[PDB]
Amino acid sequence: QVQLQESGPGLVKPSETLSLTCTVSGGSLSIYYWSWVRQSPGKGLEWIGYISNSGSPTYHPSLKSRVTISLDTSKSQFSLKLTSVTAADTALYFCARGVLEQLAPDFDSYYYGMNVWGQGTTVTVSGASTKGPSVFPLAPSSKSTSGGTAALGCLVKDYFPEPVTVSWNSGALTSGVHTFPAVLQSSGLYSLSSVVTVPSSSLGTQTYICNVNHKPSNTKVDKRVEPK
Amino acid sequence: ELVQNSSIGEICDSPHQILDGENCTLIDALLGDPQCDGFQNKKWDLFVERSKAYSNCYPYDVPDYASLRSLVASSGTLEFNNESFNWNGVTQNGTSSACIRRSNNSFFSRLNWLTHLNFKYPALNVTMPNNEQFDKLYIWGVHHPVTDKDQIFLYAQPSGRITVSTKRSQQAVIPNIGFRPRIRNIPSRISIYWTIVKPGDILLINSTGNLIAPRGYFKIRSGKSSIMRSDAPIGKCKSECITPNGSIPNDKPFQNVNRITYGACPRYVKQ
Amino acid sequence: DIQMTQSPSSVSASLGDRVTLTCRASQPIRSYLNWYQHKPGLAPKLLVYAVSNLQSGVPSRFSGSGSGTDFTLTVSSLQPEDFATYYCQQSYSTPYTFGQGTRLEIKRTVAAPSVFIFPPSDEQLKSGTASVVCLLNNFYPREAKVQWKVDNALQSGNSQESVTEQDSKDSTYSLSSTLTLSKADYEKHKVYACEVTHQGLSSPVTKSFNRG
Ligand SMILES: *[C@@H]1O[C@H](CO)[C@@H](O[C@@H]2O[C@H](CO)[C@@H](O[C@@H]3O[C@H](CO)[C@@H](O)[C@H](O)[C@@H]3O)[C@H](O)[C@H]2NC(C)=O)[C@H](O)[C@H]1NC(C)=O
Ligand SMILES: *[C@@H]1O[C@H](CO)[C@@H](O[C@@H]2O[C@H](CO)[C@@H](O[C@@H]3O[C@H](CO)[C@@H](O)[C@H](O)[C@@H]3O)[C@H](O)[C@H]2NC(C)=O)[C@H](O)[C@H]1NC(C)=O
């Protein structure tokens, strides 16, 4: 099969130079081209630039001299570099496999399809430094139960920047889990909540641990919740 | 106003023999595309391509598209003759579900798609003499599979090689295996190439796989015919001059309708 | 230098209906355009190569068309697992400008949420901040209204919320609201509650606790 994996920092201070790295899985190169696109918060996808297997790049003219993409077939990796970054560069960057073809019916110009994609690496450009979150228990009280269905969660509050990954019982609890997107409170920090609906009869029996990872703040937190 | 500021809007079928491509391009009819069966061996003084023309066969491409389009246009004839090549040791008449002829899996009518025979596809040494006194035009192709699996099941050879050569020329093509966006449920492609075999010269094919073999040659003489792109309908009238905006009488010494003309046409000037 | 425009921007269409999304171009493109399927937190997938040319793993109920400047996608029978948000590119010039995107709404199940509330943990209270969480689970439409009352005082400007994206298995949402107060403001009052008003709610629902 074929898969892509972007790797790089989650936060870059302004005026610095971003540097992310995508990775080839198990697919041939040859005619493939290799482009990245950055998804804004809701502004819409923006194309950046793409290199042939020979090593001939073309930028996106919106970024006048700010993009320099590279390629190295020895490690089957290729990186993109964004210089002189400013706050307008906060986005979610992807790497995708483009295939350049000339279709038979119309020869008039080239086609381009992003056959394979990667999940994304959230990148923020801001001056504020990183901070670890505080995980507080959302204890499943008697007032939090409805007709035998109880709910319990963990409040991951005050961290920077995005994102954080929350799991339950080291990933052994997925049914009924709703981890909400974080909100940016007035303190300039993020805060979300991850809950799970479980049968109320299993409260006095099952131990419920929530596990949180924050790659920027470099912290790994386990927090088991028991009601009281 | 010696310039005809507006044209007829229609193309006259006289005196020039006009052949409308309709749902077919010249190349699709040249290769023989299922919907283009009615263009075989059909002559034209001027061949009009339409913007609404597609292809409904097995996806391909042509590197030097502009050379081959002008060759067939200058000859004005799609007349080919089938020559019996010696394809011993291979399976002929390869079909695909993307090229439906007569409600059946088929292929380009003028191309023979070669696969292995009992999982053995030998090096092919094939000679064709061309004993005539006129240039032969051969149309052959190279198939690009999607996976090493597909390359193996089709040709029993991981690295195919093709070398179409004459006493004067020599062409070599290498397939390009890889995942490609599906075209009519097909992720594989074909690369089309042409070879002119002059009178007295010999055609030699050395192939080990991935060969879309030709079934015959075409007659080329670089005649008076040509090709044009237009959407104006073909009407019942008589007019010497023809432009992509319609026919034009040739009684005025100048013209500005379009810089592309054919036949006894007034000289073009700008607006 | 060269842009496009996709219409509409966001439209709801019920289960089993037939929706059409149109991408408008600045200049005629013939068939140098593509369409993609982008889901929550997942990598965008190709739907349409050129025009009406489908990719692997795409049902026949999807089908596009168009030429020149106008191209459309059409989902014959809308299914919940599709959902996603849809784009178009202009694969003809070098800028490769992408479409703005059109949100697809499932708009099928009509139900009210089961509402829960969570008091601030003593760990956070000892730190000088109180965060109350009101939970809304399994519910459509997205449009809801969660009001906070502290000793029957309508609260505003001190609360935030976020709505989960459509869980395709049940086509429902989940809403969480976090009321933030200082420690001094928390223990000074007694009654806290979140008042929920929603289409599926016959009457405004209130869950409350009475210590703080
Ligand atoms: C040139 O190509 C066009 C496009 O393929 C042809 O137009 C299409 O012709 C087919 C029949 O050959 C029509 O199919 C029918 O459509 C109806 C619904 O409209 C459907 O119920 C039938 O079962 C059948 O599939 C199709 O409608 C028609 N499309 C348009 C836009 O007219 C055209 O006939 C071709 N012309 C030549 C001379 O080959
Ligand atoms: C692949 O398909 C083509 C047809 O599309 C086959 O060509 C056919 O080959 C046979 C050879 O047995 C030809 O029959 C011969 O006809 C001549 C008269 O032209 C006759 O004198 C011979 O005695 C013999 O009967 C047949 O005409 C020819 N058809 C066409 C349309 O050219 C080809 O054989 C197929 N490939 C394989 C490997 O079978």
PDB file of N, CA, C and O and ligand atoms in Angstrom, chain B residues 22-23 35 54, ligand 1:
ATOM      1  N   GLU B  22     -17.306  14.935 -35.504  1.00  0.00           N
ATOM      2  CA  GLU B  22     -18.448  14.775 -34.611  1.00  0.00           C
ATOM      3  C   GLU B  22     -17.982  14.378 -33.214  1.00  0.00           C
ATOM      4  O   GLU B  22     -17.373  15.189 -32.507  1.00  0.00           O
ATOM      5  N   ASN B  23     -18.260  13.136 -32.806  1.00  0.00           N
ATOM      6  CA  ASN B  23     -17.791  12.605 -31.533  1.00  0.00           C
ATOM      7  C   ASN B  23     -16.433  11.921 -31.638  1.00  0.00           C
ATOM      8  O   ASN B  23     -16.153  10.999 -30.861  1.00  0.00           O
ATOM      9  N   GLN B  35     -16.472   4.293 -30.984  1.00  0.00           N
ATOM     10  CA  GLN B  35     -17.422   5.180 -31.648  1.00  0.00           C
ATOM     11  C   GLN B  35     -16.901   5.718 -32.973  1.00  0.00           C
ATOM     12  O   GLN B  35     -17.650   6.406 -33.676  1.00  0.00           O
ATOM     13  N   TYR B  54     -14.736  13.276 -27.509  1.00  0.00           N
ATOM     14  CA  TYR B  54     -14.032  12.616 -26.420  1.00  0.00           C
ATOM     15  C   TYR B  54     -13.296  11.394 -26.965  1.00  0.00           C
ATOM     16  O   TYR B  54     -13.185  11.192 -28.177  1.00  0.00           O
TER      17      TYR B  54
HETATM   18  C1  LIG D   1     -22.075  11.966 -29.059  1.00  0.00           C
HETATM   19  O1  LIG D   1     -21.875  11.765 -27.655  1.00  0.00           O
HETATM   20  C2  LIG D   1     -22.961  12.218 -26.834  1.00  0.00           C
HETATM   21  C3  LIG D   1     -22.534  12.013 -25.397  1.00  0.00           C
HETATM   22  O2  LIG D   1     -22.278  10.644 -25.115  1.00  0.00           O
HETATM   23  C4  LIG D   1     -24.238  11.463 -27.197  1.00  0.00           C
HETATM   24  O3  LIG D   1     -25.337  11.997 -26.465  1.00  0.00           O
HETATM   25  C5  LIG D   1     -25.920  10.966 -25.631  1.00  0.00           C
HETATM   26  O4  LIG D   1     -26.412   9.877 -26.401  1.00  0.00           O
HETATM   27  C6  LIG D   1     -26.914   8.804 -25.589  1.00  0.00           C
HETATM   28  C7  LIG D   1     -27.355   7.713 -26.538  1.00  0.00           C
HETATM   29  O5  LIG D   1     -26.375   7.466 -27.537  1.00  0.00           O
HETATM   30  C8  LIG D   1     -28.039   9.275 -24.660  1.00  0.00           C
HETATM   31  O6  LIG D   1     -28.226   8.231 -23.709  1.00  0.00           O
HETATM   32  C9  LIG D   1     -29.575   8.081 -23.225  1.00  0.00           C
HETATM   33  O7  LIG D   1     -29.867   9.035 -22.213  1.00  0.00           O
HETATM   34  C10 LIG D   1     -31.152   8.887 -21.586  1.00  0.00           C
HETATM   35  C11 LIG D   1     -31.340  10.044 -20.618  1.00  0.00           C
HETATM   36  O8  LIG D   1     -31.034  11.255 -21.298  1.00  0.00           O
HETATM   37  C12 LIG D   1     -31.193   7.522 -20.888  1.00  0.00           C
HETATM   38  O9  LIG D   1     -32.451   7.349 -20.251  1.00  0.00           O
HETATM   39  C13 LIG D   1     -30.970   6.412 -21.920  1.00  0.00           C
HETATM   40  O10 LIG D   1     -30.976   5.141 -21.276  1.00  0.00           O
HETATM   41  C14 LIG D   1     -29.675   6.631 -22.706  1.00  0.00           C
HETATM   42  O11 LIG D   1     -28.605   6.347 -21.815  1.00  0.00           O
HETATM   43  C15 LIG D   1     -27.678  10.559 -23.917  1.00  0.00           C
HETATM   44  O12 LIG D   1     -28.841  11.121 -23.317  1.00  0.00           O
HETATM   45  C16 LIG D   1     -27.067  11.591 -24.856  1.00  0.00           C
HETATM   46  N1  LIG D   1     -26.625  12.760 -24.115  1.00  0.00           N
HETATM   47  C17 LIG D   1     -26.855  14.013 -24.523  1.00  0.00           C
HETATM   48  C18 LIG D   1     -26.332  15.100 -23.635  1.00  0.00           C
HETATM   49  O13 LIG D   1     -27.458  14.257 -25.564  1.00  0.00           O
HETATM   50  C19 LIG D   1     -24.527  11.593 -28.687  1.00  0.00           C
HETATM   51  O14 LIG D   1     -25.627  10.760 -29.036  1.00  0.00           O
HETATM   52  C20 LIG D   1     -23.309  11.192 -29.516  1.00  0.00           C
HETATM   53  N2  LIG D   1     -23.563  11.411 -30.931  1.00  0.00           N
HETATM   54  C21 LIG D   1     -23.162  10.568 -31.887  1.00  0.00           C
HETATM   55  C22 LIG D   1     -23.512  10.954 -33.292  1.00  0.00           C
HETATM   56  O15 LIG D   1     -22.544   9.539 -31.630  1.00  0.00           O
END
